[PDB]
Design an enzyme around this catalytic site. Structure first.
Site, PDB file in Angstrom:
ATOM      1  N   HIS B  41      12.998  -2.567  -6.350  1.00  0.00           N
ATOM      2  CA  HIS B  41      13.469  -1.981  -5.082  1.00  0.00           C
ATOM      3  C   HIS B  41      14.131  -3.005  -4.156  1.00  0.00           C
ATOM      4  O   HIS B  41      14.853  -2.646  -3.217  1.00  0.00           O
ATOM      5  CB  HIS B  41      12.354  -1.165  -4.395  1.00  0.00           C
ATOM      6  CG  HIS B  41      11.446  -1.945  -3.497  1.00  0.00           C
ATOM      7  ND1 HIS B  41      10.187  -2.348  -3.883  1.00  0.00           N
ATOM      8  CD2 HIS B  41      11.578  -2.315  -2.203  1.00  0.00           C
ATOM      9  CE1 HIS B  41       9.602  -2.977  -2.882  1.00  0.00           C
ATOM     10  NE2 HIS B  41      10.430  -2.972  -1.848  1.00  0.00           N
ATOM     11  N   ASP B  90       8.477  -0.330 -10.492  1.00  0.00           N
ATOM     12  CA  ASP B  90       9.055  -1.224  -9.493  1.00  0.00           C
ATOM     13  C   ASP B  90       8.988  -2.703  -9.935  1.00  0.00           C
ATOM     14  O   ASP B  90       8.201  -3.504  -9.441  1.00  0.00           O
ATOM     15  CB  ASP B  90       8.425  -1.002  -8.129  1.00  0.00           C
ATOM     16  CG  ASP B  90       9.212  -1.649  -7.023  1.00  0.00           C
ATOM     17  OD1 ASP B  90      10.382  -2.054  -7.250  1.00  0.00           O
ATOM     18  OD2 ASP B  90       8.662  -1.736  -5.913  1.00  0.00           O
ATOM     19  N   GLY B 186       8.396  -7.276   3.778  1.00  0.00           N
ATOM     20  CA  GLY B 186       9.110  -8.517   3.474  1.00  0.00           C
ATOM     21  C   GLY B 186       8.448  -9.353   2.395  1.00  0.00           C
ATOM     22  O   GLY B 186       9.002 -10.369   1.976  1.00  0.00           O
ATOM     23  N   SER B 188       7.584  -7.841  -0.426  1.00  0.00           N
ATOM     24  CA  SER B 188       7.966  -7.109  -1.613  1.00  0.00           C
ATOM     25  C   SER B 188       8.475  -8.080  -2.678  1.00  0.00           C
ATOM     26  O   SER B 188       9.237  -9.006  -2.361  1.00  0.00           O
ATOM     27  CB  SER B 188       9.089  -6.105  -1.302  1.00  0.00           C
ATOM     28  OG  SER B 188       8.663  -5.023  -0.491  1.00  0.00           O
ATOM     29  N   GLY B 189       8.066  -7.829  -3.928  1.00  0.00           N
ATOM     30  CA  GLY B 189       8.454  -8.620  -5.080  1.00  0.00           C
ATOM     31  C   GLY B 189       7.593  -9.825  -5.338  1.00  0.00           C
ATOM     32  O   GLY B 189       7.668 -10.422  -6.415  1.00  0.00           O
TER      33      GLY B 189
HETATM   34  C1  LIG Z   1       6.812   5.909  -0.751  1.00  0.00           C
HETATM   35  C2  LIG Z   1       7.263   4.813   0.223  1.00  0.00           C
HETATM   36  O1  LIG Z   1       8.096   3.837  -0.458  1.00  0.00           O
HETATM   37  C3  LIG Z   1       8.180   2.579   0.082  1.00  0.00           C
HETATM   38  C4  LIG Z   1       7.811   2.322   1.401  1.00  0.00           C
HETATM   39  C5  LIG Z   1       7.894   1.038   1.914  1.00  0.00           C
HETATM   40  C6  LIG Z   1       8.351   0.006   1.100  1.00  0.00           C
HETATM   41  C7  LIG Z   1       8.441  -1.371   1.725  1.00  0.00           C
HETATM   42  N1  LIG Z   1       7.678  -2.337   0.943  1.00  0.00           N
HETATM   43  C8  LIG Z   1       6.281  -2.480   1.057  1.00  0.00           C
HETATM   44  C9  LIG Z   1       5.654  -3.430   0.231  1.00  0.00           C
HETATM   45  C10 LIG Z   1       4.316  -3.646   0.288  1.00  0.00           C
HETATM   46  C11 LIG Z   1       3.519  -2.889   1.167  1.00  0.00           C
HETATM   47  C12 LIG Z   1       2.122  -3.100   1.244  1.00  0.00           C
HETATM   48  N2  LIG Z   1       1.408  -2.402   2.100  1.00  0.00           N
HETATM   49  C13 LIG Z   1       1.956  -1.472   2.907  1.00  0.00           C
HETATM   50  C14 LIG Z   1       3.300  -1.205   2.919  1.00  0.00           C
HETATM   51  C15 LIG Z   1       4.139  -1.929   2.017  1.00  0.00           C
HETATM   52  C16 LIG Z   1       5.532  -1.733   1.956  1.00  0.00           C
HETATM   53  C17 LIG Z   1       9.875  -1.812   1.736  1.00  0.00           C
HETATM   54  O2  LIG Z   1      10.303  -2.778   0.927  1.00  0.00           O
HETATM   55  O3  LIG Z   1      10.649  -1.324   2.514  1.00  0.00           O
HETATM   56  C18 LIG Z   1       8.733   0.258  -0.217  1.00  0.00           C
HETATM   57  C19 LIG Z   1       8.657   1.543  -0.734  1.00  0.00           C
HETATM   58  O4  LIG Z   1       8.991   1.889  -2.031  1.00  0.00           O
HETATM   59  C20 LIG Z   1       9.568   0.913  -2.923  1.00  0.00           C
END
Ligand SMILES: CCOc1ccc([C@@H](Nc2ccc3cnccc3c2)C(=O)O)cc1OC
Ligand SMILES: [Ca+2]
Ligand SMILES: [Cl-]
Ligand SMILES: [Cl-]
Ligand SMILES: [Cl-]
Lengths: 56, 250
Positions: B41, B90, B186, B188-189
């Site tokens: 993502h 992902d 932030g 992520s990954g």
């Molecule tokens: C079904 C909602 O889909 C998403 C919602 C938010 C994200 C955000 N990433 C993360 C990553 C880790 C996390 C950990 N805890 C809580 C929240 C977290 C959010 C992002 O990158 O914008 C990705 C998504 O799908 C790939």
């Protein structure tokens, strides 16, 4: 011994073999000791180890 | 990362920072000298695939201390089953244009065998997640690398204890439902790293959740064990022209 219980006693990876036989293995950058279970690094920077803590 | 601490410099040596036009994009995990694992993502809105940079040995974003190593990302490999804008599958495998040099501050995390990971690592309760993401929901990102110890839940327990997309077999939950401690956007990954008998292994990828550290909700992580054979096969493959590669999964 079997790999699904207690990791077969292996420090790292474990294979079941035909019979009451188990083989342990080690990741690249490690070799298996004569106990048949332990892995010791063969390179300066083996994966999954933190040099500053290994030095102390 | 919400509710964690600074990862002491050199203690998270597998952590990767991904940049796009010099701006913070995502985290990643080094698994050997030319390969990085991240989240699919992270690449949903990339315009210029040729301006992706991976930095190893990073710690404090405000200063250059000489331990940092930057590389161009030569390939981004995403499984066929990933659909942009969604949560399942992902994962991304990144090939660097040139190997990084292993040092006290740059060390790969071990990619485990699937059996070892499924039979043993998956029952290790706590694991470390890390990154330069938001320190608070709707807050500023971290300048120093942060790390957080989080407990893993069986998926049945996650669903029961949560109160979303489905939690699939390609995912797992970890963290806390009291709003105190979580990974964030932030991050992520980045790595979810699990210790076993003196060595650390890659078990998860920071993936998604419902807002960061939202009461009643856990972080959701890509279950890396499902992808070991997929990753291993790709790492034996020759590079192809063009940065993005979609590769069949399984
Ligand atoms: C079904 C909602 O889909 C998403 C919602 C938010 C994200 C955000 N990433 C993360 C990553 C880790 C996390 C950990 N805890 C809580 C929240 C977290 C959010 C992002 O990158 O914008 C990705 C998504 O799908 C790939
Ligand atoms: Ca720096
Ligand atoms: Cl040595
Ligand atoms: Cl520990
Ligand atoms: Cl291209």
């Amino acid at each position: 011994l079997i790999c699904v219980n207690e990791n077969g006693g292996c420090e790292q990876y474990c294979s079941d073999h035909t019979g009451t036989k188990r083989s342990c293995r080690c990741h690249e950058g490690y070799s298996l000791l004569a106990d048949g279970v332990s892995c010791t690094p063969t390179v300066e920077y083996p994966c999954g180890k933190i040099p500053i803590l290994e030095k102390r | 990362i919400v509710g964690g601490k600074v990862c002491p410099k050199g203690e998270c040596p597998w952590q990767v920072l991904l940049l796009v036009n010099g701006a913070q994009l995502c985290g990643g995990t080094l698994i050997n000298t030319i390969w990085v694992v991240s989240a699919a993502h992270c690449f949903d809105k990339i315009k210029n695939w040729r301006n992706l940079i991976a930095v190893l040995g990073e710690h404090d974003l405000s200063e250059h201390d000489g331990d940092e190593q930057s590389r161009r990302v030569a390939q981004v490999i995403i499984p066929s089953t990933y659909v942009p804008g969604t949560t399942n599958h992902d994962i991304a495998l990144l090939r660097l244009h040139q190997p990084v040099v292993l040092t006290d501050h740059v060390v790969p995390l071990c990619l485990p065998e699937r059996t070892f990971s499924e039979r043993t690592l998956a029952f290790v309760r706590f694991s470390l997640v890390s990154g330069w993401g938001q320190l608070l929901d709707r807050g500023a990102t971290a300048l120093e690398l942060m790390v957080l110890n989080v407990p893993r839940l069986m998926t049945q327990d996650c669903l029961q204890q949560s109160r979303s997309p489905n939690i699939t077999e390609y995912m797992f939950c970890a963290g806390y439902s009291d709003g105190s401690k979580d990974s964030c956007k932030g991050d992520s990954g980045g790595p979810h790293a699990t210790h076993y008998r003196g060595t650390w292994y890659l078990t998860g990828i920071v993936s998604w959740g419902q807002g960061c550290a939202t009461v009643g909700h856990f972080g959701v992580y890509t279950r890396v064990s499902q992808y070991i054979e997929w990753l291993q096969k790709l790492m034996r493959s020759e590079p192809r022209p063009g940065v993005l590669l979609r590769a069949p999964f399984p």
